[PDB]
């Protein structure tokens, strides 16, 4: 009837062509205006096997996002291996916009509709479609912002939870807003305000999910063990500015503990800094940008997922320890591409 296969995809968007925003300028020539009448066909009485971790659409996307960033964001100075490139760095307006992908003739996308499907294995409620859902090309570390939510339960996805070296994606069914701000008039200092109560509630629910998946052992959350900031802190781009955010307070193991009413449950404020000297995620190298613009800078974003790495190693104890994930952004893309798989019919 059909055979799973990979191929070249074509993107669709709806960005206005008159806008100066970089995502819109890129999409207006990279993507086709959105289908106003999209259709999805429920496939009756078929169970299909999926593997979110080996699925070419994430690779193609990653290529599209790297092309977008290379074309749009222009650093003052770039350092590649034995290469220095000097180029003007004009200030730009930056805001992720959602985009779809679509297959040409002969190829369709199967989408799993099971509520608790974990990115791999069999799925019973499967449909077919020509185009994906809106996806915002957001780049983030340890946290998955402005994404889609889980439907029934907080879902733990991994190529293999048993392996300590495989990143773990956590899909939330209730987003948490994070409000980061650089006040107008130390121009790099900034902060992010997170509601403590919801944060700790979803944190305890996630902890219980991990306990269920891991023989009810004692779950510990700790800050990262080391690395460059892009991972030891929380990296993102907002209004063209590169924010690194200290998330030490977000893994407080006592606020979920049974210490009754304590200093938790308040609005937790974590420090952040804008840095011009960053390590490019597109490729190895460094990038120096212009200093941040004047005036209020703000971004309110819905944390929808969590990136984690487990320590592991000669456990034989009461506890499993976890630390925030990040690094490879193909996993960030997989976090939303887990539902889709391309298939040939001819």
């Amino acid at each position, epitope marked *: 009837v059909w055979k799973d296969a990979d191929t070249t995809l074509f993107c669709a968007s709806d960005a206005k062509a008159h806008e100066t925003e970089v995502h819109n300028v890129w999409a207006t020539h990279a993507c086709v205006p959105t289908d106003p009448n999209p259709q999805e066909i429920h496939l009756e009485n078929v169970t299909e096997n999926f593997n979110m971790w080996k699925n070419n659409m994430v690779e193609q996307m990653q290529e599209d996002v790297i092309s977008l960033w290379d074309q749009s964001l222009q650093p003052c100075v770039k350092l590649t*291996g034995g290469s220095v490139i000097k180029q003007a760095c004009p200030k730009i307006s930056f805001d992720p916009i959602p985009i779809h992908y679509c297959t040409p003739a002969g190829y369709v996308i199967l989408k799993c509709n099971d509520k608790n499907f974990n990115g791999t294995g069999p799925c019973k409620n499967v449909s077919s479609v020509q185009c994906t859902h809106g996806i915002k090309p957001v780049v983030s570390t340890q946290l998955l912002l402005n994404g889609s939510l889980a439907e029934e339960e907080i879902i733990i996805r991994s190529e293999n939870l*048993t*392996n*300590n*070296a495989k990143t773990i994606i956590v899909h939330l069914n209730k987003s948490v807003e994070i409000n980061c701000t650089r006040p107008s008039n130390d121009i790099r200092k900034a902060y992010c305000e997170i509601n403590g109560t919801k944060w700790n509630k979803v944190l305890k629910q996630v902890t219980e999910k991990l306990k269920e998946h891991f023989n009810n052992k004692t779950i510990i959350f700790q800050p990262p*063990s*080391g*690395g*460059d900031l*892009e*991972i*030891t802190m929380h990296s993102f781009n907002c209004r063209g500015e590169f924010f690194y955010c200290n998330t030490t307070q977000l893994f407080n193991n006592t606020c979920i503990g049974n210490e009754t009413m304590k200093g938790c449950n308040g609005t937790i404020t974590l420090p952040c800094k804008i840095k011009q000297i960053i*390590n490019m995620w597109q490729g*190895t190298g460094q990038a120096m940008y212009a200093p941040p613009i004047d005036g209020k800078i703000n971004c309110v974003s819905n944390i929808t997922g969590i990136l984690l*790495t487990r*320590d*592991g*190693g*000669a456990n034989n*104890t009461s506890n499993e*320890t976890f*630390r925030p994930g*990040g*690094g*490879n952004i193909k996993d960030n893309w997989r976090s939303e591409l887990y539902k889709y798989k391309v298939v040939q019919i001819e």
Partner: antibody
Amino acid sequence: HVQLVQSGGGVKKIGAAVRISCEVSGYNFMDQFINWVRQAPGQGLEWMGWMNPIYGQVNYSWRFQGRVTMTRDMYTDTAFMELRGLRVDDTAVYYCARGPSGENYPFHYWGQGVRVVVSS
Amino acid sequence: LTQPASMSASPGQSVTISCSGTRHIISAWFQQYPGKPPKLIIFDDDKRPSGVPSRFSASRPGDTASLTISNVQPEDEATYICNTYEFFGGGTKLTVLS
């Protein structure tokens, strides 16, 4: 022809610290993790941690976190491991290792091992 | 894990070393000549790389992964270790019986 060697061992005092560097050749350093494993004299193997050289993703064992720090240098294609605060039991032979293309485990490739003698 | 420390078998016969406690997570097998870095000789339960002979075989039907060696030879005097991710066995030092 995957080649990879160690050049950092020796004989050290009590406590102090030691540095071990493991160079590779035959593939792009950015791909594939590196793992550190210690062999006590006449005793089984013990895994201490691993590193992803892309940004510096490190993962440590509970027995060693807070003691050892793993570092990297992309341009010279060399991984490093520093064992700050070593005792007598740390007298061992140290291995840097990697696995097949794509995935980390198991450890198909082992360097050469280097001696570390924790002295008085 | 669960591994014998030292077996023995005369040249020509067959020997089996089983590592238990794998928790049902694949299996790897390493041969170590004391003094030098080890060398894996099989991977993924029932497959082996090049450079080694068909004298070696293995099977992981569950909690115990067994490794069989026929026609003992003088370089078969080695320590054999079971592997599961970052886990290694106590190693079995098998030697000749001259």
